[PDB]
Design a protein around this ligand. Structure first.
Ligand SMILES: [Ca+2]
Ligand SMILES: [Ca+2]
Ligand SMILES: [Ca+2]
Length: 254
């Protein structure tokens, strides 16, 4: 017999094969990067550097998604806490969190630990949860979000648009790529996007647009006060080495 996907993931976790890639966040009006989104990559020993996408569902059912995320959080602290000079005060670091992680208070501890790797207030830690994940967690989010907020951690709604809004105290809305993709393709698409942006402003929330690929999209978004942009226009997820190099180039002109 052969070991299941979840068992293979466990072996990979114990051998430290899950590693962070870093996708840059840019201001809406341009300028130096203001943060990164952390992506999970698997340097598979015999199948090379990959995305564990097909494996994520298995990690969710087993629970292993939580310790996988923790291992990423620790590797980020190791990677970036020793280059905090290349990081402007306030630099955002965003993680994709799972619903399971919101049980008990482990997430508080995990964030404390990451924050301790940088000077107090030096980075802004952003935890990203989908609408679905927040609804799955509604019994715990009142207290959990209070403890995380107390530490200066922010909560973003991931893939937004993909009455419960009054059930959760969040900091940021991330506009799903599907909406950005349709900028210009038809007038309507836009109205709906305009409504999401305007809803952010009503609620005093920051806004990130995902999937920013063209200058037309960027300009449309920036004209409406979108705070932050992510997507191939700004940069693909990159290894640490490439991130530090780019950050060097940017201090270099500032
Ligand atoms: Ca998630
Ligand atoms: Ca997303
Ligand atoms: Ca993106």
């Amino acid at each position: 017999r052969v070991a299941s996907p979840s068992s293979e993931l466990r072996r990979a976790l114990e051998a430290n094969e899950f590693i962070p890639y870093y996708q840059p966040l840019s201001p809406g009006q341009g300028g130096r990067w203001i943060g990164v989104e952390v992506l999970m990559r698997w340097r598979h020993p015999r199948e090379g550097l990959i995305r564990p996408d097909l494996f994520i569902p298995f990690a969710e059912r087993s629970g292993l998604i939580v310790p996988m995320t923790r291992a990423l959080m620790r590797q980020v602290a190791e990677d970036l806490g020793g280059h905090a000079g290349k990081l402007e005060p306030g630099f955002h670091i965003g993680f994709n969190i799972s619903a399971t992680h919101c049980h008990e208070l482990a997430l508080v501890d995990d964030c404390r630990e990451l924050l301790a790797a940088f000077p107090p207030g030096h980075i802004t830690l952003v935890l990203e949860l989908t609408e679905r994940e927040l609804i799955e967690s509604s019994e715990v989010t009142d207290r959990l979000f209070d403890e995380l907020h107390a530490l200066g951690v922010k909560i973003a709604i991931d893939d937004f648009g993909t009455a419960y809004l009054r059930k959760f105290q969040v900091d940021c809305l991330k506009i799903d790529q599907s909406f950005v993709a349709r900028i210009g393709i038809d007038t309507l698409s836009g109205h709906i996007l305009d409504s999401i942006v305007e809803l952010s402003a009503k609620l005093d929330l920051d806004i990130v647009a995902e999937g920013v690929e063209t200058p037309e999209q960027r300009d449309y978004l920036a004209a409406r006060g979108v705070d932050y942009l992510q997507g191939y226009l700004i940069g693909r997820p990159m290894p640490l080495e490439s991130l530090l190099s780019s950050l060097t180039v940017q201090e270099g002109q500032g």
